Each structure stands twice: as structure tokens, then as C-alpha cells.
Amino acid sequence: LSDWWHQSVNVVGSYHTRFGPQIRNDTYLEYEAFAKKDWFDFYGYADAPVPLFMEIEPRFSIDKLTNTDLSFGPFKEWYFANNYIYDMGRNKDGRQSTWYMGLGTDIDTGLPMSLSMNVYAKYQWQNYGAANENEWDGYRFKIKYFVPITDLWGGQLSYIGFTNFDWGSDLGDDSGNAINGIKTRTNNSIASSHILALNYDHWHYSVVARYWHDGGQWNDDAELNFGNGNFNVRSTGWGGYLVVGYNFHHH
């Protein structure tokens, strides 16, 4: 229901993406959904070509459920947080199933914005055949903030930012070395996003600047050869996205 459940279908163009060994530029369809009902909030999105990649972020209110005001300081609420990533891949080999679970919260900055912080531990199932499949591996700190800016061109301009700090994984240790001498993979990783979004009654346009540090836990500059010659991994740097979509909702 529009009251709490929001949907959107979007077209996305990406440029210089860094989650994998080689740089990428893609375009694809995407389904989004944002929800917020008294005891649980949710965000998720699914991408499909011009096979299937989805990421969901469900969170449950410990306060609402425990029915105990755990509010304290800037900390408005506490949550049992979940960040689940699924990638079907073209094989049964080139797939990913990642579950991050932990503690989350909403911060009251006294400013005209929204701020959330989460910490998770994660179990790794499939991971494109990597050395860390099926085991508890690594942790993640996720910080995301929303900031209403102004009205621009008849729409509402706003800023959104979130970062995923991943560390403590055992890959890198358990992976080999590159032709390069350095290790192929990484125990940690950072993916930071900056979003400028224009929202109209239904249509919206968004520009996304994203920065990676060892994107996808690929050790930046590692020298590899997949059968086409040696090449260096460029897992650290900027990439971007253009997003045009439509939010559904009855009047």
C-alpha cells in the first residue's frame, strides 16, 4: 500500500563499475521498493539486463518488538538489521548469496536529515567460487544518510549518501598471488556512494557517484591473465550511474 510501501521501476546506466576483476559499464532495468511500518523498515532493489541481481535490506525494531524504549542519546531506535545480496549469475558457479546480520540504529542529529548506522557479521554461501564460500566471514559497517535540499525545476532535489565498510574477511589471505607479486584478493573493502536525486510526482532522475577501495575485495593493481593477456585490476577509484525511473502510487 502507498501508505507505507513504495515501488519504482528504473532504467540504469553505469560507468566504470568496480565490484569485479575487470571494469564495467552496463545498462539495465531495476525494481525498487522502500517500506516503513511501525515495527519494520525495508529497502531493496533488483536489477535485470537491458540475469538477476537483488539486494534487500530488511530491519526489525527491537524497541517495537521488545516493547521497551531502548532510546538513548542521539540513538532514537535500535534494530535487528539485515543486508542480503543475491546474484544468480550465468552459471551455478558465477553466483553469490551473502547474508549480513547485526545491530542497527537511527541517529537524531538535530539537523534536517536522516542518519542510520548498522554493523553486521555475515555468513557467505556462494561467492563466484571464491575461497570464502560457505563460512562465517568478515563484518560490515554501513552508514547511510538522507538530506532534503530544495525545490529545483518543479521537482524536489535531495542528497543521499551511504558507505559500506567491509573488513575482517579471510579472502586475500586464502587466495593466491597475482602475476604482479601482490595478493589477488582483499580482506577488506569500501564502497562509498553519493547521490543527487530529482523527484517529481512519479518520475525521478538521479546521478550517482561511487567510489571503491578494493572493489569487490579485489586487490587493486593485482596483475592477472584470464586468457587474453596480462591486465591490471583497477578496483580502487570512481564510477557512476544515471538513473531514470517511475514511482507508482494511487492518488
From Swiss-Prot:
One example GO MF annotation: nucleoside-specific channel forming porin activity
Keyword Ion transport on entry: yes
Disruption of the gene: reported phenotype: Loss of susceptibility to contact-dependent growth inhibition by CdiA-STECO31.
Cellular compartment(s): Cell outer membrane
Major subcellular location class: membrane
Entry keyword set: Cell outer membrane, Ion transport, Membrane, Porin, Signal, Transmembrane, Transmembrane beta strand, Transport
Bilayer topology term: Multi-pass membrane protein
GO biological process: monoatomic ion transport; nucleoside transport; symbiont entry into host cell
InterPro entries: Channel_Tsx, Channel_Tsx-like, Channel_Tsx-like_sf
A GO CC term attached to the entry: cell outer membrane
Pfam families in the record: Channel_Tsx
Function: Functions as a substrate-specific channel for nucleosides and deoxynucleosides. Has a greater affinity for deoxynucleosides than for nucleosides, and does not transport free bases. In addition, constitutes the receptor for colicin K and phage T6. (Microbial infection) Serves as a receptor for CdiA-STECO31, required for adhesion between E.coli expressing CdiA-STECO31 and this strain.
Family: Belongs to the nucleoside-specific channel-forming outer membrane porin (Tsx) (TC 1.B.10) family.
Protein name: Nucleoside-specific channel-forming protein Tsx
The gene coding this protein: tsx
